[model samples]
Target: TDRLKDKVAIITGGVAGIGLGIAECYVREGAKVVVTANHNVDGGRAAVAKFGDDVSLFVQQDVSKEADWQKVIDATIAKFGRVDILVNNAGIGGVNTAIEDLDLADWQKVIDVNLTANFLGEKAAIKAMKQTADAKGSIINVSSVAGLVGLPIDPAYSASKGGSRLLTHATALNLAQRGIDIRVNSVHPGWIDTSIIPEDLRKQIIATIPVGHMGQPQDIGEVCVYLGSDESRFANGAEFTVDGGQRA
Candidate 1:
């Protein structure tokens, strides 16, 4: 399935969870992918090893930092020459606490990683993508169902993802109105089995999902593949839900 043949994509935090799922999907669809993470370099390498070095690359990145974003972009172009897709999937849930108990530092950290990183990613990807002949690109921001609604368990997480959701909208509009071919959209996932999900919350979470099960990373990956593919060329500033109708 060469849905993404020859396309070069960057997936942040691609060493684990939904990020890793997106990378695997992109590679399966024939895209050359670069997966970045601040830690777990070995895990990332091992994950992409099956794809062969020519098909995938792994770089260390702290998404919260602006400089790291530039480095990843540079590395991708250096390896693949052009980047056609950017998945701002790196995010933090932050310390889960009530508003009265939340620490300012904890709240800020979530915003930096989940929200600010998306801004940096789009900035870098858009600039690099413009260098291509078509000046066309796709940016997939992985927000969450929590972004669309309040998550009583984690206020900062909800806030950061919500910000990410809106940021995608604004960027998509800005780029299209400016005549740039790049399309930006957000993916909102419901309760997913990413290992980060505590076992204690499993039964309760699944009960709320219409499908009676938590989503798999591959489920989210499939939607991301569409957004990254040319098939969704007309899609812009859209919010794609991969939540088993939890949003319904």
Candidate 2:
């Protein structure tokens, strides 16, 4: 329960699935949590209800917008008095298509949401975190197995996640260079059960996982908790894979 005692965390796209699970875990570990979702007002409210007011709040946010990013951080500070952890978990995946077959608009949409949103969140959180008493914090960027390897038809998502992976490492190193104690890292989740995965695609992906099963949201949640906690203080600019050995 004391793992994250006294910490305040902001999780984007935290209304359901992986983000919600992570928020629940953060609350259990004694951290105050704020979640952001674009349109899942009901889900966000339900998450806050399940976690309790003492530990959680929800904000309506479009992570792709810079102004909304500022609003989210400001609201978090206003509500919790400090921001100790930032989880860049919001993203969008487009339909499968080769570069030639892909619409430029579709590509742009995916990149803006998946890759650029992480940059915005990280930039905003760092600004707020540097002013906190600790001046030391944690940022977890959600990448994917597609970022590390390749997905057959999900080009835009793959590119965006890959960019996120590098951005995590680069940001961590940049902060280190500036003498900031902030730790930044990326998580590459494999086949996790989420609304994004189509039923047929889920079955196909599960067959490839060495564990012979798809992972639950809790699987990724556990990792998010560890990254956000001080136990992983020594880890920065690193990429942690959670794919049930799918790549192996």
Candidate 3:
């Protein structure tokens, strides 16, 4: 129950779905969590209602903006003294518009929310953690299975997540080579039962998997808890797949 006891974590896009699931698990494990949710005020209240204000704090964050990332990191440090975990779990569910039909703005918007935002968030977290001696940190980038291959329906999202996969590997190697205590990794979830998909489409997706089932939010959240905790101390620069043999 205390896997993350005495740690502070920051989870983006945490007001709902997989992010919210992670929040629940992190709080249950005894970690203070800071969640970034820009959608509305109700979600913030919901977080406090679930975990209490003493353990959970919610903030509005435009993750693509550098200043917003800074504020998130600053606020976490101010509230908790040190940041031990960072989960870049926020990403957009891009419309099914084809590449040729997608305008420049739409393409950029998906990239900004999915890919660039993770980069910005990861950078800020590292910077904040570097400033102190208690700098042991874990950075988890939430990537989808689409990142490993091209998905015709949402090319932009695929590209963004693919970039996250590569960026995480590069960052992990960079940190390890430099002897920084931080660890970086990417999680690839397939056919996840998240808000981004409708029930019909989710069923269709699950049919393709050998398991014939969509992954629950807690499935991914449990893996995240392990990565954030010292249990996964040797795991870095790895693609941790929770896809239930979908890729196989």
Candidate 4:
């Protein structure tokens, strides 16, 4: 019941789907949560309302901007006095287009939001985490199965997430060398039933999974909880796959 009793967590894109599911579990495990949403203030507010007074708060933030990252960290410290976990989960799925058909601006946008935003969030969170004498913090980057394998239909998305996977490993090594005690890891979730999944593509994707079913947001949420908890202290620079054996 008190898995994260005194911890404070900040989740990017924590308004709906996988992010909100993680926030809900964080609150249940006794962690105070601050959720940042780019354009969904109402959704963030709704999550807070469901979790109630002591467990959660909402922060409107565009994760792709460094200024917004600063605001999110500062506001979290102001309210909770400490930041123990940072979940970099905000990303835009790049338009499904072949490399030959993709526009430069669209490709750059995907890189900025998916890859650069992760760097900003990790940097900001590490700054705050370093302030503590006991620098035990966890940074979970939400990459995708696309990161591990190539996706022919999503060139930009594949490149961005693939970059994120390695970035997570590099950051974890960097922190370890600095004796920061911060754990950095990435999660690759395969075809989950979220608004992000198009109705037309859902059936075909589900059939490819060895489990013969699509994953739920809670599936990823539970993984986030384990990674956030002390149970996963030995797990760092690791990539946990939650795809119902689809990647297999």
Candidate 5:
């Protein structure tokens, strides 16, 4: 129950699916949380209503925007006192342009949302967390199996996630070499049960997974909890694959 007893986490896109699951798990593990929402107003309200005021603060944030990230971090510090963990979990997969018929504008949009958002969020987290008394933090970036290997039809998402994976490793090394206490790591989830994924595509992707089924949101959530906790301080600059071995 005390895995994260005195910690605070900022989880982006935290009102639904994977983000919500991570927030719920963090609350259970005794961490104060700031969950962000930019879509589905009802779900955002429900998340606030569900977590209630004692353990959480829900904020509306356009994660791709730097100003909102700063506002969100300031608000979190005002409420929770310090930020200790960050989960860059918001991402999109709809910009699936073929190489021969590419839309550079759409491709850039996907890159901005999926890749650039994490870079901004991570910068915000590091800047804020460095001021905390504990002087140590965990930053968890959510990628996918697509980041490790090529997947058909969604080049933008795959490339963005791949960028995230490398970014994590580089950030971890950069921080560690400079005598920092924060750890950065990435998680690669494969076909988690979520409404964001298209229904028909789910079935087709399942056939490729060796486990023969999709994983639930909690599967990925628990891993984030572990990484954020003190128990995982040594696990930096690494990839945690929770994809039912789909990459294999």
Candidate 6:
């Protein structure tokens, strides 16, 4: 239960879905969590309520913006003293249009939120973590199984998530070479039961998954706990796939 004792973590999109699951598990494991959401202010507050104000805080953040990333890092440090974990979990599935019919604006939005935001979050967290005496921490990019495979339904989302995977590996290498102890990795979840998935497609999606059912947020959450904890010290620049054998 004390796997993350005394760790200070910042989890984006913690208002619901996989992010919320991670937040709950983090607090249960004895960490101070700062949850950020671009919208759903009430949901964010309620998450804090569930986790208790003593160890949790909610910050309204647009992850794609550098200024917001800085503010979130600052708020977390002011409240919890230092940053130890950063989970870039906020992302959007772009329009379900074929490549020939896709809009450039939609593609840009997906890239900004899913790919660029990871870059911004990593940069900001690296700066904050470097201020510590040891500068050791963890940065987790919440990629999707679509990132590992082709998703013709939404090419933009797949492209953006794929970009996140390589970005994580490259960043981890850079940080490691610079003697920084921050471990950067990507979590690829497959068909998690979140509001992000349309209800009508759930049944069809379930049949396609090798497990014959969708994965729960807790499944992904547990992997995130391992990544955020000291137990995963050797798991740098790796892809932790929580896809229930979808890719197996």
Q: What TM-score fits each model?
A: 0.97, 0.96, 0.95, 0.96, 0.96, 0.97
Query: What lDDT would each prediction earn against the true structure?
Result: 0.90, 0.89, 0.88, 0.90, 0.88, 0.92
- After superposition, the stretches of candidate 2 with alpha carbons farther than 4 Å from their true spots are 196-200
lDDT by residue (104-217, candidate 4, tens digit) is 999999999999999999999998988841688999999999999998889899999999999999999999998889999999999877776676677788778998777888
Model 6 TM-score, 2 decimals: 0.97
Candidate 5 versus the native: TM-score?
0.96
lDDT of 6 by residue, 183-246 (tens): 9999999978776666677778887788888888888889999999999999999999988788
Model 3: lDDT of residue 42: 85
Q: What's the C-alpha lDDT at position 111 in model 1?
A: 91
How displaced is residue 63 in candidate 6, in Å?
Answer: 0.6
Look at candidate 3 and tell me the lDDT of residue 98: 59
- Which residue ranges in model 3 land beyond 4 Å of their true spot? 196-200
User: Candidate 1 residues 160-225, lDDT tens each?
Assistant: 999999999999999999899999999998988878656668878888899888888888899999
lDDT of 3 by residue, 1-248 (tens): 79999888999988888888888899989999998887755887888788998888888898889888988887887888888899999988787875788888888999999999998988888987887425579999999988987788899999999999999999999999988989999998887776676778777777879988878887888999999999999999898889888887
Error of 2 at 34 (Å): 0.4
- Candidate with the larger lDDT of 2 and 6: 6
* Highest-scoring model, lDDT: 6
State each model's C-alpha RMSD to the native.
1.3, 1.4, 1.6, 1.4, 1.5, 1.3
Question: What would the TM-score be for candidate 2 when compared with the true structure?
Answer: 0.96
- Give the per-residue lDDT digits (tens) of candidate 5, residues 93-206: 755557668688878877888889988988899989888645589999999898999867888878888999999999999989999998999999998887756768877888
RMSD of 3: 1.6
